[PDB]
Amino acid sequence: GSSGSSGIPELKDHLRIFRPRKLTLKGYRQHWVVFKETTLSYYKSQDEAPGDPIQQLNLKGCEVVPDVNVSGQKFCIKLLVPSPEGMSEIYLRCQDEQQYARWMAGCRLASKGRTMADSSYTSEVQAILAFLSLQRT
């Protein structure tokens, strides 16, 4: 690929977040999410940031369980992170496979210590896009 000199590769997009085991209204709530090489933090409202996120966690180590169901072009990612108070279970649902492969692949790379900066990143997005197709009947 064509790439020279630029800032660190970071993703900016608010995915689907739902927490039935906590004070919530109107189901989902608009929030600000940001994926970092080996880090991840979100906020309640763009206002907060860049100040400080609601709860920062080091992806490197957390768990990532795939919950996608091609049956209905659905792709969710269950991120399980340990907390000194309890746990950090966040449900992220993607609209399509594109956003999924991108984010998902990023989480895995961070969990293993790796980062999106690495080329392998794309190596995951592809393998996935295809894998899904295979699953089909």
Swiss-Prot record:
Top-level division of the source organism's lineage: Eukaryota
What are the residue boundaries of the PH domain, all occurrences included? Answer: 13-112
| Tissue note | Highly expressed in lymph node. Expressed in thymus, spleen and leukocytes. Weakly expressed in placenta, small intestine, stomach, testis and lung. Overexpressed in B-cell malignancies.
Compartments, as annotated in UniProt: Cell projection, Podosome
Q: What does this protein do?
A: Plays a central role in cell adhesion in hematopoietic cells. Acts by activating the integrin beta-1-3 (ITGB1, ITGB2 and ITGB3). Required for integrin-mediated platelet adhesion and leukocyte adhesion to endothelial cells. Required for activation of integrin beta-2 (ITGB2) in polymorphonuclear granulocytes (PMNs). Isoform 2 may act as a repressor of NF-kappa-B and apoptosis.
Oligomeric and partner information: Interacts with ITGB1, ITGB2 and ITGB3 (via cytoplasmic tails).
Question: What remark about domains does the record contain?
Answer: The FERM domain is not correctly detected by PROSITE or Pfam techniques because it contains the insertion of a PH domain.
Q: Which family does it belong to?
A: Belongs to the kindlin family.
Name of the protein in question? Fermitin family homolog 3
The gene designation is: FERMT3
